[PDB]
Enzyme design. Structure first.
Site, PDB file in Angstrom:
ATOM      1  N   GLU A 109       0.810  -1.201   0.000  1.00  0.00           N
ATOM      2  CA  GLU A 109       0.000   0.000   0.000  1.00  0.00           C
ATOM      3  C   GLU A 109       0.849   1.259   0.000  1.00  0.00           C
ATOM      4  OE1 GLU A 109      -3.822   0.409   2.275  1.00  0.00           O
ATOM      5  OE2 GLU A 109      -2.536   1.621   3.580  1.00  0.00           O
ATOM      6  N   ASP A 147      -6.193  -8.207  -0.374  1.00  0.00           N
ATOM      7  CA  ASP A 147      -6.545  -9.607  -0.551  1.00  0.00           C
ATOM      8  C   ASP A 147      -5.961 -10.437   0.586  1.00  0.00           C
ATOM      9  OD1 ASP A 147      -6.267  -9.645  -4.228  1.00  0.00           O
ATOM     10  OD2 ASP A 147      -7.598  -8.591  -2.835  1.00  0.00           O
ATOM     11  N   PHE A 162      -7.444  -2.473  -9.945  1.00  0.00           N
ATOM     12  CA  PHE A 162      -7.078  -3.843  -9.575  1.00  0.00           C
ATOM     13  C   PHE A 162      -6.022  -4.515 -10.426  1.00  0.00           C
ATOM     14  CE2 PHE A 162     -10.887  -4.610  -6.779  1.00  0.00           C
ATOM     15  CZ  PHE A 162     -11.443  -3.350  -6.954  1.00  0.00           C
TER      16      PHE A 162
END
EC number: 5.4.99.27
Length: 340
Positions: free
Chosen positions: A31, A80, A329
């Site tokens: 991130e 995820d 994504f």
């Protein structure tokens, strides 16, 4: 409504297969928050590295540890579970001397850093993510290579990944059933997941329809063009088309597709007529977003992975890396490389 697997391809359906996420280490996500911790405040930012857990399963653990409300543990997004991901969490803790997060232990998890912060973490409030993936048992190396090359230049459709619609598609199913009634949804969480799934399905359909044209990246009168890497967008007009098309081709501007909702969608005339026709049959889903007061918005139709590079370990194995902005994504990239 167009089903996920029927969504139009930009480069055409791949002519080979491959395995995705065979192992957690085969899918690495880091991130990119975009800002540093305030250093003070009623909240505590906690950067963590997890291997086989979901942002909720870890947000609850951090909740019990701090002996706080599982609801006071926010985050920028849900990484995820079947992968090794690094992300920030945020817990609202009293002015009491910051707890010993070093003590926070959990299988498959690992605290890396923590500090005081003023506000909580607004979902979607981040710059992007860095991905490092390994595709295994690739049947057509030549096909993937060419596709990787073509993507550096043309990009891929910026579709919402399947996880946006919940496991088994429960989030979209929920949205659809709720739209067929007016029974208020008590659960604010489910409310969010369903509304999100509804608007995301519609965006995907519009993009899937637009991709059926000879020139998908052709700007038309009324298009809502967004500045690259920014939220700001403006409407295209006939007299400016030539100049606007040049900037779109240079990737300075992105053609957007609508995220249906209350208020004006953004596009006008020809572009707007197109977007409305693309989801004309979805009256119920549109009514739901409108009544729940979910403001219409714009989202880049295409996606250009940044820093795209790759290396083939062998004829059937390749490691790929790239950075994507918030809301985009990796699966949308992989979708155009192989069939899984």
């Amino acid at each position: 409504m167009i089903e996920f697997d029927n969504l139009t391809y930009l480069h055409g359906k791949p002519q080979g297969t491959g395995l995705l996420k065979a192992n957690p280490e085969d899918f690495v996500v880091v991130e990119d928050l975009g800002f540093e911790p305030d250093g003070e405040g009623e909240h505590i930012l906690v950067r963590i590295l997890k291997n086989g857990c979901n942002t909720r399963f870890v947000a609850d653990a951090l909740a019990k540890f701090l002996k706080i409300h599982a609801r006071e543990v926010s985050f920028a997004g849900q990484k995820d579970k079947h992968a090794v991901t690094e992300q920030w969490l945020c817990a609202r803790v009293p002015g009491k001397e910051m707890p010993d997060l070093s003590a926070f232990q959990l299988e498959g998890c690992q605290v890396l850093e923590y500090a005081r912060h003023k506000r909580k973490l607004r979902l979607g409030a981040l710059k992007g993510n860095a991905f490092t993936l390994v595709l295994r048992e690739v049947s057509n190396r030549d096909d993937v290579e060419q596709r990787l090359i073509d993507i550096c230049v043309k990009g891929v459709p910026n579709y919402f990944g399947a996880q946006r619609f919940g496991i088994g598609g429960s989030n979209l199913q929920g949205a659809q059933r709720w739209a067929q009634t007016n029974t208020p949804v008590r659960d604010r969480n489910k409310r969010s997941f369903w509304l999100s799934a509804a608007r995301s399905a519609l965006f995907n359909q519009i993009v899937a329809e637009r991709l059926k044209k000879a020139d998908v990246n052709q700007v038309v009168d009324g298009d809502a063009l967004q500045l690259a890497g920014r939220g700001s967008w403006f409407v295209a007009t006939t007299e400016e088309l030539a100049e606007l098309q040049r900037r779109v081709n240079d990737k300075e501007l992105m053609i957007t597709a609508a995220l249906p909702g209350s208020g004006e969608w953004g596009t006008q005339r020809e572009a707007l007529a197109f977007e409305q026709a693309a989801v004309a049959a979805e009256t119920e889903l549109q009514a739901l977003l409108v009544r729940e007061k979910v403001e219409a918005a714009r989202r880049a139709m295409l996606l250009y992975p940044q820093q795209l590079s790759w290396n083939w370990w062998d004829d059937v194995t390749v490691e790929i890396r790239f950075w994507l902005p918030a809301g985009s994504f990796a699966t949308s990239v992989v979708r155009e490389l192989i069939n899984t």
